Amino acid sequence: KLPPGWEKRMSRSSGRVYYFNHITNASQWERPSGGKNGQGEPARVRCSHLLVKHSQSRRPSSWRQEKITRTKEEALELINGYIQKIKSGEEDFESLASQFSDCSSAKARGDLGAFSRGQMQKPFEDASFALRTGEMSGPVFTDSGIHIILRTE
Amino acid sequence: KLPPGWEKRMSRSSGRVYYFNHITNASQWERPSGGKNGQGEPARVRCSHLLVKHSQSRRPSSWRQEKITRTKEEALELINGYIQKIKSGEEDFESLASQFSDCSSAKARGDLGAFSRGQMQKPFEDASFALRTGEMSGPVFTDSGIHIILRTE
Predict the structure, then answer these.
(1) Where does the PpiC domain start and stop, copy by copy (chains A, B)?
(2) Distance from A58 to chain B by nearest Cα, in Å?
(3) Which residue among A63, A83, A92, B108 sits deepest, i.e. has the most Cβ atoms within 10 Å of its Cβ?
(4) Phi-psi region at A8: left, alpha or beta (left = phi > 0; alpha = psi -120 to 50)
(5) Active site residue A47
(6) Beta bridge partner(s), residue A124
(7) What CATH number is attached to the domain comprising A63?
(8) Domain range holding B7?
């Protein structure tokens, strides 16, 4: 039981039990399922994303700044903060992506349109295809930087 | 702190702590916020809903059945099951609304379009306007029956 990549975990040095997805890096308190079988993954998905680059990005530059100097660590710090703000309900994905995404797609509020496998960097693709409609990933690491992915279709 | 209608609660006879919204009846393990002030509520929203009627509905009839005979209790049982299935990620709101909503809007996968205050039954409206974009309510009781509301805009 439990959909692809999902496993019950516990925070280190704590008694907090949650569910974590090994493919999307998403964490949630809620059990990810309650049967459907032989479903596989979708052949095509539509996602939006929020990218936070760092000094180690293949191209450490964006519409936000000519030279990204933040470290991988600081980038992750920011990504976790954005995820926290979205999950709290205080800020929505689209407004945060429009303001803070280091990807040009920020102009379209982070929307990347629909795509199939073979287009995006492997970890990005793996996470995108492991998300069910409406789900949001955790921190996804690619050569571009760190992403938060939202599956819209 | 905590947005409109939200309060930290605990399940009776248990140690399970969660957050509950008194206006939308939504329950979640996640703190609903992490500051914005003087925000009020949106003047217009767009929502989708899934209605489960019961024998006490003003009009106990729908495209699903000429006579709804289920009790208020059974209707609530069903609504809670749908909320559970959506939160698990096993089923999405639109497909469930298309199949089980007793409202004609089922034809549009539950979409009601955009609206302002003064159009919908009071409890429905109160819940809709207390939802932030993307949020889903808990069981909302109106004269029509019991609803699950999803704010899309």
Answers:
(1) 42-153
(2) 33
(3) A83
(4) beta
(5) no
(6) none
(7) 3.10.50.40
(8) 1-32
Q: Which residues of A touch B (CB under 8 A)?
A: 3, 29-34, 36, 84-85, 87-90, 92-93, 132-135
Q: Which of A49, A54, A62, A105 is catalytic?
A: A49
Collect all residues with Cβ–Cβ distance below 8 Å to A129 and sequence separation of at least 6. Answer: A41, A42, A45, A117
Do B22 and B70 have their domain in common?
A: no
Pairing of strands B6-10, A146-151: unpaired
* Closest Cα in chain B to A132: B89
Experimental method: X-ray
| Helices B93-100, B72-88: crossing angle, 10 deg rounding | 150
Sign of the Cα torsion B101, B104, B105, B109 reads positive
Q: Give yes or no: A144 in active site.
A: yes
On whether the CB atoms of residues B123 and B14 are closer than 8 A, the answer is no
Q: Which residues contact A138 (CB under 8 A, 6 or more apart)?
A: A20, A21, A24, A25, A26, A27, A83, A148
| Cβ-contact A2, A30 below 8 angstroms | no
CA distance B73 to B56: 11
**Structural domains of chain B, count:** 2
The experimental resolution of this structure, in angstroms, equals: 1.4
Chain A hits for B34, Cβ within 8 Å? 84-85, 88, 90
E strand or H helix at A86, and its extent? Answer: helix A72-88
With contacts defined as CB-CB under 8 Å, which chain A residues touch B92? Answer: 132-134
**Encoded tokens for A112:** 């990347």
Cβ neighbours of B132 in A, within 8 Å: 89, 92
d(CA A59, CA A69): 11
Q: Residue B14 belongs to a domain with what CATH number?
A: 2.20.70.10
Strands lying side by side in the sheet with A111-115 = A111-115, A45-52, A146-151, A140-141
